[PDB]
Structures are given as C-alpha cells and as structure tokens.
C-alpha cells in the first residue's frame, strides 16, 4: 500500500523531540506504516457520492491531536514544517481534505455558509475567515523517497480556543484525521509544556539495591504565555516515603520552585530508588503563579537484579545489543523490559523509525544548518570527557554571528577534579562546553564545533537542549560597504587626477536674470523624455484639472492615485534584506553511568550496548586525571 512517513519537523525555537512528541508523530508514523485498513474502504466509499460528513468522519476515524498549545494574543505566528516521504516503492498521491475547506469547486454567486448557530462550527468558520490554520501544499504527490516539505501555520490573531479537523486522505491507502488544537489567550495565563508523554513520565527501571540511582532529568517549558512561576508539592512524595518504611523514593534534587522565562527551559532531577518490583505510581501537583494543577504522574518499576555474587565467585572480565535478549538481560523481570520499552518510546527519539535526525525541513529561509541535529552523546563513565562534533553551514549569502547558549546545561561559574562540589545544585551534573563560544562565519563556510561534556560523580541521564543564535553580521556588512566607499573615493581621486581642478560653482549671489539648469544634449533630452513617458500615469486614471474641478470624487481619486504612486517607491527603496536573527537548537542526550553499572550494563540502552561494552573492555572514554591534591 502506498503510504507516507514524516521524517522530521522544524519549528521556531522548539526542540525537535518536543515537536515530535507534541504532534504525537510516533503514533502517526506507526499507523501510516502498518494497518489492514478495514473501515477505510467504507470511508472512501462514503467520500465518493458525497456521503461523508466532517462530524461523522471525525467520530469514526479516531483523530490524532495536533497540539499547538496556547499563544499570546498578537504573538508571532507559529510555523510547522513537516517532511513527507514515500517509504513504499509505489509513488504516493495524497490530498489533504476537509469538507469545510474548499474541495476544488468554483463558487459563483453562492452565499457563504450561514450562521452556524453551533459554536463548534462557528469556531471552524472564524478559522476559515481569518486564515488561522493554513497548510500550504494542500494536495501533493511524491515519487518513492521524495520529500514534500509541507508547511502548516497558525495565526494567533483572534482570542479563544480553536479546533480544526483535517484529514490526510492518501489516494490509495489509509486516511487519518488530524485535529489542529490551539488556544489564543488575550491574557497571560501560565500553561506549562504538557505533552501526553511528559504528563506520565515513564521513569527508567532502576536496580533495587543501586548504590546511587541515576538522576533523571525532566524539562519544563513555559509555552506561549507570560513567564511561569512553578512550585512542586513534595507532600505526595513524603507520603510515599512514609508508606515505604521511611525510605526516600522518587526524590526531587533541584529546587522545589522556580521561575521559567517565556519559552524557557527548567530542569528537575529525580532519583528513583525502589524497594519492590511493583509499579511505583506517584502523582505530584504543580502550583503555578495563578491557580493551576498541571499534575504529573511518575511511573517506575523495580529492576530485580541477579543476586550479587560473593567476592569469591565473581565473573572475570577482560550479549548482543540488538535482540530482545539484551532487554531481558537488562532486567530479568517480564514487565521491566516493557517499562524500558515504554520509556524508550517516550524519550529516546533514536528508536523511532521515522525520525531522521537531520535538518530535513526548513531548507529555505534558515540562515544556517547544523549538519546533524538531535545529537546523542554516548554513554559515559563517572568522570568522563566525551566529545562530539557538530558542523554549521551558512546558507545565507550574508555573514553570520554564531553564539552558543545552554538552557539548563550551563556550567557553574574542564571542571577541577578535586572541586566537583560546584556541580551541586546543577541539573546536568556535568560541564558542557563548545570550542567556538561565539564566532563569525562567512557565507558558505562550514565550521566544526566540538561539544565536550565533563561529567561529575553522580550518575545521571540527561536529554537537554543547547541553543545556537545566528544573526546577520552588521559589523561585517558595514565593513564591506565602507570598503566600497573607499574604492569609490579612490576612483574619484583618479578622475580628479585625470581632469585637474574641475570647476564647481559654490553658490550664486543675485543672478539678475533667472537662469535655469543647462540644457541637456538633444539625445540626452530624448532619453529623459522616454524615461518620463515610461511609468506614465494610466489613461483611465488621469483626471485633468477641468474634470477634477467639475467632479470632486474624481479629484479625490486622482489624489489617492498620486499618493499610491508615491508610496510604491518607498517599498522598492527600502532594503528588504537583513532577516530576523534565528535561534536553532540541538538536543543532546547522554548517560552518565557508574563503573559498576557500566560493567554490568545495568542502564545502557540496547541501542548502545555494543558501544558500552567496547568502552568497558577497552578504554574508549577519556578520564582527565589532572593532579592529585595530596
């Protein structure tokens, strides 16, 4: 069956993992990949002969939520670039259809849809009226392996909520409904980033007797409205501890409260220390500045590790990563691997088949490209210095200033081995650095940037986001213009050398007869006449003085046309270049693991178990020793 796949999605100032999670593209890719499509045949039959209706189709088609969240009124519209490709060899023709929207039918003196009298259809009609939700390509067709680069944009100009259902409608294949859900708040009301995978955070299963449970990072984003003041009530966790014979479980490490700026990132570290193999469902509230719940459920399980051998009989040291045997070896429990797979689908973007971890969409209009987005730092030892390289390319013909920022990944004001206590209270428990902090870059120049992580003593799993800000280099462009001006001055000096002391009349004092400008040569006069006759005012719009005096509205129209023609010059004269500074972002995920955990492969994902075993058996990660204090 000719199907489609979403390879990647690009949006301004939002992590690619977060965008994929918010759109729920895992389920979309799965459904578009495999389905018998029993009822879709009936759906196509009803689409034929015009039997289908939007409401019934939505009720029977199991819509998928395209969540755009909340947008402050008057804020910048949000754009979503989705790359659609054909995994199947058969060429795929697809037609985004929605019966409310026009279906390629010519309207001639047909009254627009009347007063709906039902607020759902009314909201649909306001969306249609004010172009709130628009997908540019509409219907398309793709050869096997092609990329369509579809764009869907939302315009936060109206107040209130808006839900618009459209459906993909592949010509021969499945037809899935997407419900674009957004709310535009005229007033600032904090709403934390609340994707369904983040609401129920699937904690990675951990060893029952682990000496130091791995810190697990949870990232909160403000969203559209004003900055969010969050406070997490530890009382349910305290109740859990009291129930668990007074042992700390699901402990919060960071601050209990905080103030995320608009479109910001705040990281909270959890320690999951279990006592049983049972599920540990714990529900915690999030009190915002204004009244709110935003409750978060944490789920984890017990690893039930193989019994630790006595020192006498220990496995000597000097199994395949891919198979499910690896998952079973990482946790003998039947449901431990199920929880691990759920957590992988929740957070590990690599395991998702569709995602490409490439710049993909957004080729046009982006100042620069990171060659490889969504970069994963490998599993690292306790005090490990792990490096990766990311190359940035300037597509713009203009020089670009490149600055590097860390949202929650900032180093404390690499790290000295003795004085690692500075890492206390820091979400990463490591020091991220990039070799170019801020560098200029010429057009078409590719720069290598080394991202290096120096980890601390606390085992951790980080999935952070690092921002790179690209702006047009005003200094460089001004220098170029100044060089051009200097060249022009040199040319003027050369012309002066050619013609010594050309006279220029400084001023005029009482020239008794009025003297006009010198007459041009007749050829130049003819050329100027032809130039004037070009851009001649249109015949039907030129009102003579007599007609203007006779008819006032014609005089007003003539004045308006003069004003319009004067205005037309200003837009041309304005230099349309210098686009807005653009912030790109790359997600980095890594596993700071203890030596015992690495040796036993306790928490390495199956995707990287081969690399973990390599790093254990043969030293593959550096451990900067520095100098001992004593």
């Amino acid at each position: 069956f000719p199907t489609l796949e979403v390879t990647d999605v690009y949006c301004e100032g939002l992590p690619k993992q977060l965008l994929w999670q918010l759109l729920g593209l895992n389920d979309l890719n799965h459904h578009l990949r495999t389905e018998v499509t029993a009822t879709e045949l009936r759906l196509r039959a009803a689409q034929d002969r015009g039997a289908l209706t939007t409401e019934a189709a939505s009720a029977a088609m199991r819509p998928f939520l395209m969540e755009f969240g909340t947008h402050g009124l008057g804020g910048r519209p949000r754009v979503v670039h989705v790359e659609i490709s054909n995994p199947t060899p058969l060429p795929a023709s697809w037609q985004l259809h929605s019966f409310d929207d026009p279906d390629g039918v010519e309207l001639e003196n047909w009254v627009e849809p009347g007063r709906p009298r039902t607020e759902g259809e009314r909201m649909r009609d306001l969306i249609a009226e004010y172009k709130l939700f628009e997908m540019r390509p509409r219907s398309g067709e793709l050869e096997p392996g092609a990329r369509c680069t579809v764009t869907i944009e939302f315009r936060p100009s109206v107040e209130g909520s808006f839900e618009l259902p459209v459906f993909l409608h592949i010509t021969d294949g499945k037809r899935l409904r997407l419900q674009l859900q957004a709310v535009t708040t005229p007033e600032p009301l904090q709403l934390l980033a609340l994707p369904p995978p983040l609401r129920t955070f699937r904690l990675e299963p951990v060893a029952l007797g682990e000496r130091a449970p791995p810190l697990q990072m949870y990232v909160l984003r403000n969203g559209g409205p004003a900055p969010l003041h969050w406070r997490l009530d530890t009382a349910p966790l305290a109740a859990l501890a009291e129930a668990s014979w007074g042992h700390p479980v699901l402990e919060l490490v960071g601050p209990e409260e905080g103030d995320i700026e608009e479109g910001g990132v705040a990281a909270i570290n959890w320690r999951f220390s279990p006592l049983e193999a049972k599920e540990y469902r714990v529900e915690v509230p999030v009190l915002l500045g204004d009244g709110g719940i935003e409750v978060i459920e944490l789920l984890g399980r017990g690893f039930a590790p193989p019994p630790a051998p006595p020192h006498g009989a220990a496995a000597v040291q000097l199994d395949d990563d891919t198979p499910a045997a690896a998952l079973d070896s990482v946790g003998g429990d039947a449901e431990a691997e199920a929880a691990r797979a759920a957590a992988a689908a929740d957070r590990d973007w690599i395991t998702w088949r569709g995602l490409s971890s490439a710049p993909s969409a957004g080729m046009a209009g982006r100042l620069a490209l990171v060659d490889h987005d969504l970069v994963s730092l490998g599993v690292t030892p306790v005090r490990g210095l792990t490096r990766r390289i990311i190359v940035l390319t300037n597509k713009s013909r203009y020089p670009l200033a490149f600055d590097w920022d860390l949202g929650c990944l900032a180093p404390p004001p690499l790290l000295p081995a003795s004085q690692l206590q500075l890492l206390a209270g820091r979400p990463l428990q490591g020091a991220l650095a990039i070799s170019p902090a801020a560098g200029s870059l010429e057009p078409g120049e590719r720069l290598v940037c080394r991202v290096s992580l120096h980890a601390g003593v606390t085992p951790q799993v980080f999935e952070g986001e690092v921002r790179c800000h690209v702006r047009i280099d005003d200094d460089a462009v001004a220098e170029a213009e100044a060089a051009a001006a200097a060249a022009a001055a040199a040319g003027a000096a050369a012309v002066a050398a050619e013609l010594p002391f050309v006279e220029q009349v400084e001023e005029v004092i009482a020239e008794a007869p009025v003297r006009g400008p010198p007459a041009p040569p007749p050829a130049v006069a003819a050329a100027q006449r032809a130039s004037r006759l070009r851009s001649r005012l249109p015949v039907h719009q030129y009102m003579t003085t007599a007609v203007r005096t006779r008819i006032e509205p014609l005089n007003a129209a003539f004045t308006a046309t003069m004003e319009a023609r004067t205005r037309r010059l200003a837009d041309a004269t304005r230099p349309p270049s210098w686009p807005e500074p653009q912030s790109i972002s790359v997600t980095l995920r890594g596993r700071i693991l203890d030596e015992r955990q690495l040796g036993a492969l306790r928490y390495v994902p199956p995707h990287e178990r081969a690399a973990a075993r390599a790093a254990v058996v043969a030293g593959a990660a550096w451990v900067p020793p520095a100098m001992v204090p004593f």
């Binding site: 990766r388 043969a618 593959a620």
Partner: protein, 59 residues
C-alpha cells in the same frame, strides 16, 4: 603528524562509509559526527593501551 594520520583517515572513511576516500566536505557531510566518534574512540583505545603498558593494569 597530521599528514601521517591523514592516509589512515582516508582509508577508514572509505572502508566504514563507502565514500571512496572523499576529502570533499559535501560528500562526507552527514558523517562528520560518526567519523569523529570512531576516530576518537580508536585514539582513546590506543592511549589507554599505552597507559596500561606503562603501568600494567590487571585487564
């Protein structure tokens, strides 16, 4: 030393990524991260082996 390593680098590029020893940035793009990771892993393995030889590790 960099010129000494460059030949082995070209050989590894050709072997691992089937790029026919492309020193051209455009072709070997989208492989810089993996190539650098493999090269640094090899360098670290060699350095650790030398360190163990200097101070015999029970490995």
């Amino acid at each position: 030393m960099r010129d000494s390593l460059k030949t082995a680098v070209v050989s590894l590029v050709r072997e691992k990524y089937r790029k026919s020893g492309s020193m051209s940035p455009n072709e070997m793009a989208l492989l810089y991260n993996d190539l650098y990771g493999s090269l640094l892993a090899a360098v670290h393995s060699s350095l650790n082996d030398l360190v163990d030889a200097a101070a015999a590790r029970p490995r």
